[PDB]
Design goal:
binds calcium ion; TIM Barrel; about 35% helix; 9 helices; glycosidase; about 290 residues; alpha/beta; 3-stranded antiparallel β-sheet; 8-stranded parallel beta barrel
Length: about 290
């Protein structure tokens, strides 16, 4: 149904061959933030059938209003709902601790992931994303110790499922991370980009991380500007897609949602594709590998 993932030095293996998959990221799961209406089994089914998506990413809010801190069971439920649907539809599912300062609530993240590990640890579909987007923060002094603690907790329960760690400066500093990898099994590192804002320079940093023996994973990328607005940068988008395809980098487009911003796949209150949506759909359906 779904081949298990393993990280061997530089790349991610699905079963026994180097592979990469394309997918979608839901918007914030926070109560009242709109994206939550897409955390349904019906939507996941639509991505597998209509889009041919192989990945669905649950972006669980943590410290903002309506997030996991304010409503734990409420948010935990939307995630479980999406993961169960992904498992049923032969797709990979990323459970993401959608934070910008995760080091602030370490025990909370540990509590959450232990439960998720116990519940989903044996299905080859689940992937853990323990720190969405770290800011101007040190890798070795802030992100690494936090990540190691969480990974330690997970690994005690689930010894082999892929864990993805956020990198400094909006998950752009993957080179900085490669110079001080985490000594653990099946760990990947996140890279986030927005084709309307980031280019070849960010691609070079990625190349450097790849050269140092670290496997990357694009848990979030936009065809539009970093603030989620502006138009689609067609050229940069293509260049980025070729880069990921070449290096077998899995990716999740941000976000299958209908907020009134360029990054959304649908126009407000509709299933009518935006410029971004049409583009990403084409990208997702012609991807070389499927879950
Ligand atoms: Ca496992």
């Amino acid at each position: 149904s779904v081949e298990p993932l393993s990280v061997n030095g530089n790349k991610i293996y699905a079963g026994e061959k180097a592979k990469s998959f394309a997918g979608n990221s839901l918007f914030w799961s926070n109560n009242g933030w709109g994206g939550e209406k897409f955390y349904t089994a019906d939507t996941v089914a639509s991505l597998k059938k209509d889009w041919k998506s192989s990945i669905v990413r649950a972006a669980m809010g943590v410290q903002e209003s309506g997030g996991y801190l304010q409503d734990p069971a409420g948010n935990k439920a939307k995630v479980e709902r999406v993961v169960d649907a992904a498992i049923a539809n032969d797709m990979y599912a990323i459970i993401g601790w959608h934070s910008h300062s995760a080091e602030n609530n370490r025990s909370e993240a540990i509590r959450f992931f232990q439960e998720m590990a116990r519940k989903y640890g044996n299905k080859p579909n689940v992937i853990y994303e323990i720190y969405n987007e770290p800011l101007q923060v040190s890798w070795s002094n802030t992100i690494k110790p936090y990540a190691e603690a969480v990974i330690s907790a997970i690994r005690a329960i689930d010894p082999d499922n892929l864990i993805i760690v956020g990198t400094p400066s909006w998950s752009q500093n993957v080179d900085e991370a490669s110079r001080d990898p985490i000594n653990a099994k099946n760990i990947a590192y996140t890279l986030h980009f927005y084709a309307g804002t980031h280019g070849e320079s960010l691609r070079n940093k990625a190349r450097q991380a790849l050269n140092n023996g670290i496997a990357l994973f694009v848990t979030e990328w936009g065809t539009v500007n970093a603030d989620g607005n502006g138009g689609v940068n067609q050229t940069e988008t293509d260049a980025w897609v070729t880069f990921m395809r070449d290096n077998n980098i899995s990716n999740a487009n941000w976000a299958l949602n209908d907020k009134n911003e360029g990054a959304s796949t649908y126009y407000p209150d509709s299933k009518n594709l935006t410029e971004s949506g049409k583009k990403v759909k084409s990208i997702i359906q012609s991807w070389p590998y499927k879950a």
